[PDB]
Design a protein around this ligand. Structure first.
Ligand code: HEC
Ligand SMILES: *C(=O)CCCCCCCCC
Ligand code: SF4
Ligand code: F3S
Lengths: 162, 58, 949
């Protein structure tokens, strides 16, 4: 009989479980118990460049001064930069406003400023969006290197309306 | 295969009519044992069969 | 049954480069001392899978079959997981201290230190070795090759000034004269496939013809237009005869009149094609190689140049011999070697071992405890290519980098790291490479070099000079050793050397010429077989049996060999013998299969004089293909000649079958009682073979068995002709020396008294016939007979035009293997996954990483079939739909590995409704041709025509 706190019975599982290695499951042979072993340091795959500026207080303002956006005008006026701001950013920062968000109303954690207060260039978003400034985190795990620049053009349009 | 291609495309009614007259007609006639004893039933069926096989050779 | 509990483990710390479900590609290179290539490594979320080719403006060295199957060496559980010292497990710190202290003692005593290696074409490795030598007063560096080519190197060195090989361009010549060349094989690291094939296509009324002179029979012979059986004592004389014609000279050549009748013709034609001809020869004699240089200079052909010499082979048979002598003669101290295996490859290895007994601190770097790792002091655990860093210069004007793709599985250490630690250099080899990268790379350091894989370096032609070639000609003509029966050693496409001793894909991979697997053998011509009473035979179960034989040499013998009577294999008075199978250390008895023969490589010569005797018993063979000849079935491989192609209408060389209507004839494809389906829109697919480019199609097999998870079957269960392969290469000989000679015996036939005797003689292939290859896979039919009879409806067709094969409703009533007239359909019989009857890579837990997760693994009772590349083309449509684009021109061709991994441009895959692709320009041709059009099955794979002359 079928219970709900345990999976149901099966009739001759010929090809149900895996012989190959589907990505996130557990195995026995590997270094850890995982199945997601880390790549070697210093290597470069096809279609990716490493970011050449180090962490904050010495590489922050060096990235703020001389670092530019490698996009074109066909890609900026597409609306895809707004959709990424609709997902990953309204939870702390405001959607049309700045700092109002969804979570300083509920008072879960405080200390989110506006965009009038801090002057930010188009290369100073990209250094914070990959590393975080003391209360953010690395959003490089979520967004890709083509897509952080699509967000940075949209944030500049939000400061100009303020 | 052209044996049937040139028959189906040209001799359409002759080809299929020969099936009906030599099968479908007698199928619903000479199955009743009372009818099998009637002179006009037998004569009628005999005529249809003869015409059908003429068509077969045609 | 309750059904198991599945769990999933995300990262604590996820790296930026890794996205689950997204494959990554790395630019790496390979060079193992024998094979070499530029390639891409496809990796999963942490590990490498199937090898791709690197084509970023440096597509000069594509991977062969041996390289494609090399991934199994990474995931081989039979590797030295931990280094040993004095036979016991030890740390690397123990190894480091042992080596350093022995070097100190050698310095104090004034001893001998020798590093052994093999052709390390590496600017930075060589520099590091130089630093070692600079620090150590008495270090000698010496290079050892298994199969040597030092005679060629001496000829080039003494004329141009360096030890390197001429990289001939076979696409820049019209007449190819080959005397023992074998350039489509392993000759000088044969990578001339594309160059040759490019000149075999009748684009206009032109085509490069090939003259083959040889004792053995090889792929270049099969791909030749003319082939003359000739022994090595005749070949040397023939070479001088060529010389006397191209270069006006009078040298008293002693050569058979019938041989002269053909040699002279070829030489005069070669001479006539000034700047458009090429002389290539593989005679193991510096004097012969010098004459080749002289003739190619006289021809002044475009194919000959020293601007980019080949850096791949740089050994010496004189230096190695001196080394061996000194180990036994004098006192030799710490000897360190990496990738060197004299015991088993060295013919005089018995004396080598006695030399090892006189030396101290023998250090050997390897992957396995082989025969030399056994007789040593320190067994060092080496990384397997993808676990290491490096750089390779294949040719004179290039530089490339090698990236690791997987973090070290076992406790290994790089050879160069060891050298750095004994030299006293801080850091590691990677850091060393970084420091020395700016010396070559004038552009961006890593971002534009590691990312792409290669770097272009300029070069220049070498200066020539005066040399008495006339003297060399007279020396060769005077040279003569005419005795009795002789043999010639050779390498295979599945077995280059002992680096793949236990590789199941190369053990299973059948020989492209003889069509057998899992074993070694002796090649004897039928004219010799009749004298020695040797033979082979087909038995009741479908496989082959054959007699045994004994090879005797001066002061030695083999006492048990397995001969195969290949009719045209040997010219006359000669024997073929493959070298490289008899290994016994660190491997299972299922892999300890074959004969070594390296003991017969006396003085590094491939030609030896022998005595052949018949033995007592009978041997069983795992033979893949049964029949040797083609029965006169011209509707399978249509062939014609160039002048017919040029002057006659297609009706006389590419004729399609006709069917009678109302007293009229019409093309058979127009007769149909049914109605067709609309596949005029939405990506109708095809696939295109041209038979001229099919040289051997070797690496096309292993790449198709890489995604599709086809299991490995042993010697038995292939002996019963029950193997598992999705595509196959054929082999069709002839009777009476032509294919048109097997169409004159058949069309002229009588009634029932002669037709019982001619069809029984047309399966015995005559002496020196013509060879033809034909790749055969499941062409996805449209009126497919394999469809309509499946009772459980497991097969169907799509709008694209495939034959979709569901692995679920297939309840194995084995009908659809019968109604396929081509009969390419492989039912599986046992369970090949996890049982102990098949102890191959499918069984063990460490070796189930080659298997990609996108294609399922079959269990029992379900059939499988060479489908079109669905698991790639459903991703090419996917990656062109998210963006919002139309699929490009050559985007379908680059994803299906049945076509995107072959060397030449033989296999062409792609779209047809797109009227700008490569397939749509090939389908509208005068060579348009299907297999078995009179059956009326409408295939989707069309062959062209063999246009030999
Ligand atoms: C909640 C965890 C947040 C998320 C989600 C995003 N941001 Fe943020 N951001 C947050 C805080 C609390 C701060 C201030 C931290 C401090 O120490 O002052 C910020 C800061 C920024 C800034 C200004 C950086 C500067 O140097 O002045 C920018 C331009 C910014 N954040 C952008 C940004 C974007 C583009 C986001 C979507 C990916 C985003 N933030 C999310 C809190 C949080
Ligand atoms: C696992 O042990 C459960 C197997 C359930 C089998 C169901 C059979 C139904 C009646 C034939
Ligand atoms: S070739 Fe064989 S498998 Fe492919 S469709 Fe025709 S019958 Fe079916
Ligand atoms: S006919 Fe059908 S059940 Fe399997 S064996 Fe063939 S797909």
């Amino acid at each position: 009989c079928h219970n709900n706190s345990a999976p149901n019975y099966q009739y001759f599982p010929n090809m149900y479980e895996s012989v190959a290695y589907e990505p996130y499951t557990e195995a026995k042979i590997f270094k850890g118990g995982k199945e997601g072993q880390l790549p070697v340091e210093g290597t470069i795959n096809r279609g990716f460049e490493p970011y050449e500026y180090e962490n904050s207080t010495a590489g922050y303002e060096l990235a703020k001064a001389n670092l530019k956006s490698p996009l074109t005008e066909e890609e900026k006026n597409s609306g895809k930069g707004k959709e990424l701001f609709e997902i990953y950013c309204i939870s702390c920062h405001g959607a049309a406003g700045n700092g109002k968000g969804k979570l300083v109303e509920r008072e879960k954690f405080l200390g989110v400023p506006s965009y009038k207060d801090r002057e930010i260039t188009e290369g100073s978003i990209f250094h914070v969006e990959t590393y975080g400034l003391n209360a953010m985190g690395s959003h490089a795990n979520q967004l890709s290197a083509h897509e952080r620049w699509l967000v940075a053009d949209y944030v500049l349009k939000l400061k100009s309306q303020l | 295969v052209t044996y049937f291609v040139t028959r189906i495309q040209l001799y359409n009614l002759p080809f299929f009519g020969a099936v009906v007259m030599n099968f479908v007609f007698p199928l619903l006639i000479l199955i009743n044992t009372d009818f099998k004893r009637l002179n006009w039933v037998v004569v009628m069926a005999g005529i249809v069969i003869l015409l059908g096989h003429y068509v077969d050779f045609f | 049954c309750e059904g198991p509990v599945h769990k999933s483990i995300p990262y604590v710390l996820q790296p930026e480069q890794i996205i689950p479900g997204v494959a990554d590609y790395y630019a790496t290179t390979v060079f193992d001392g024998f094979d070499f290539a530029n390639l891409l490594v496809k990796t999963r979320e942490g590990r490498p899978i199937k090898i791709e080719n690197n084509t970023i403006a440096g597509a000069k060295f594509s991977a062969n079959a041996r390289i494609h199957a090399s991934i199994l060496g990474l995931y081989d559980s039979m590797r030295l997981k931990e280094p040993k010292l004095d036979g016991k497990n030890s740390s690397w710190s123990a190894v480091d201290l042992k080596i350093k202290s022995s070097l100190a003692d050698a310095k104090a005593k004034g001893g001998q230190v020798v590093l052994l290696t093999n052709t390390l074409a590496s600017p930075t490795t060589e520099k590091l070795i130089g630093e070692f030598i600079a620090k150590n007063p008495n270090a000698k560096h010496v290079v050892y090759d298994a199969v040597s080519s030092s005679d060629a190197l001496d000829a080039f060195e003494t004329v141009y000034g360096e030890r390197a090989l001429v990289d001939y361009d076979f696409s820049k010549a019209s007449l190819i004269v080959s005397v023992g060349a074998d350039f489509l094989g392993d000759w000088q690291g044969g990578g001339y496939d594309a160059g040759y094939a490019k000149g075999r296509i009748p684009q206009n009324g032109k085509m490069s013809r090939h003259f083959q002179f040889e004792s053995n029979m090889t792929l270049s012979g099969a791909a030749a237009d003319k082939r003359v059986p000739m022994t090595t004592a005749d070949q040397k004389q023939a070479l001088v005869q060529i010389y006397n014609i191209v270069v006006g000279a009078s040298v008293p050549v002693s050569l058979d009149a019938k041989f002269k009748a053909e040699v002279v013709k070829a030489a005069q034609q070669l001479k006539a094609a000034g700047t458009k001809g090429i002389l290539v020869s593989g005679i193991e004699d510096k004097n012969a190689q010098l004459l080749v240089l002289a003739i190619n200079q006289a021809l002044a052909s475009e194919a000959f140049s020293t601007a980019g010499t080949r850096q791949i082979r740089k050994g010496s048979n004189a230096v190695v011999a001196q080394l061996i002598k000194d180990m036994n003669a004098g006192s030799v101290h710490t000897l360190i070697m990496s990738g060197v295996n004299p015991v088993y490859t060295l013919a005089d290895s018995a004396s080598f071992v006695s030399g090892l007994k006189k030396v101290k601190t023998s250090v050997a770097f390897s992957l396995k405890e082989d025969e030399t790792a056994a007789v040593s002091t320190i067994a060092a655990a080496a990384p397997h290519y993808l676990e290491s860093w490096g750089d390779v210069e294949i040719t004179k004007g290039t530089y490339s980098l090698t990236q690791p793709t997987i973090r070290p599985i076992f406790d290994t250490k790089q050879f160069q790291d060891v050298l750095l630690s004994v030299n006293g250099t801080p850091g590691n080899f990677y850091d060393y490479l970084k420091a020395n990268s700016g010396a070559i790379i004038a552009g961006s350091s890593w971002n534009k070099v590691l990312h792409d894989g290669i770097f272009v370096v300029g070069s220049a032609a070498l200066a020539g000079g005066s040399y008495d070639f006339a003297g060399a000609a007279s020396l060769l003509s005077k040279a003569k050793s005419s005795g009795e029966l002789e043999l010639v050693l050779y390498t295979k496409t599945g077995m280059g050397d002992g680096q793949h001793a236990n590789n199941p894909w190369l053990q299973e991979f059948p020989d492209p010429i003889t069509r057998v697997s899992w074993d070694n053998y002796v090649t004897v011509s039928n004219a010799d077989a009749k004298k020695f009473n040797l033979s082979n035979e087909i038995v009741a179960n479908g496989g082959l049996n054959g007699s045994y034989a004994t090879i005797t040499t001066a002061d030695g013998n083999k006492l048990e060999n397995v001969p195969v009577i290949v009719q045209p294999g040997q010219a006359v008075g000669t024997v073929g013998l493959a070298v490289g199978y008899g290994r016994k250390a660190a491997l299972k008895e299922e892999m300890q299969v074959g004969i070594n023969a390296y003991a017969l490589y006396k003085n590094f010569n491939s030609v030896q004089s022998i005595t052949l005797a018949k033995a007592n018993g009978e041997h069983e063979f795992a033979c893949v293909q049964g029949q040797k000849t083609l029965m006169g079935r011209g509707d399978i491989i249509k062939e014609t000649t160039l002048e017919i192609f040029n002057t006659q209408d297609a009706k006389h060389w590419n004729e399609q079958p006709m069917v009678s209507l109302d007293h009229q004839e019409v093309e058979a494809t127009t007769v149909d009682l049914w109605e067709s389906f609309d596949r005029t829109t939405g990506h109708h697919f095809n696939l295109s073979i041209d038979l001229n480019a099919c040289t051997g199609c070797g690496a096309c097999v292993i790449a198709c068995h890489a995604e599709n998870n086809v299991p490995v079957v042993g010697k038995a269960e292939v002996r019963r002709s029950r193997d598992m392969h999705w595509l196959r290469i054929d082999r069709y000989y002839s009777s009476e020396s032509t294919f048109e000679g097997d169409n004159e015996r058949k069309e002229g036939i009588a009634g029932l008294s002669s037709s019982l005797s001619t069809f029984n003689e047309m399966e015995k292939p005559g002496d020196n016939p013509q060879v033809a290859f034909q790749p055969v896979m499941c062409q996805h039919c449209n009126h497919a007979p394999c469809e309509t009879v499946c009772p459980v409806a497991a097969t169907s067709h799509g709008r694209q035009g495939q034959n979709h094969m569901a692995y679920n409703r297939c309840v194995g009533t084995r009908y659809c293997a019968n109604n396929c007239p081509y009969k390419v359909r492989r039912f599986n019989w046992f369970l090949y996954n996890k049982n102990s009857e098949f102890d191959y890579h499918m069984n063990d837990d460490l070796g189930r990483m080659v298997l990609n997760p996108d294609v399922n693994v079959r269990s029992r009772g379900v059939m499988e079939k060479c489908s079109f590349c669905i698991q790639s083309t459903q991703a090419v449509i996917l990656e062109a739909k998210r963006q919002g684009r139309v699929v490009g021109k050559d985007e379908f061709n680059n994803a299906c590995a049945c076509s995107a991994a072959c060397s030449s441009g033989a296999m062409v895959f792609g779209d047809v409704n797109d009227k700008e692709s490569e397939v749509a320009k090939l389908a509208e041709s005068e060579r348009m041709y299907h297999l078995l059009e009179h059956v009326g099955t409408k295939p989707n794979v069309f062959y062209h025509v063999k246009v030999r002359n």
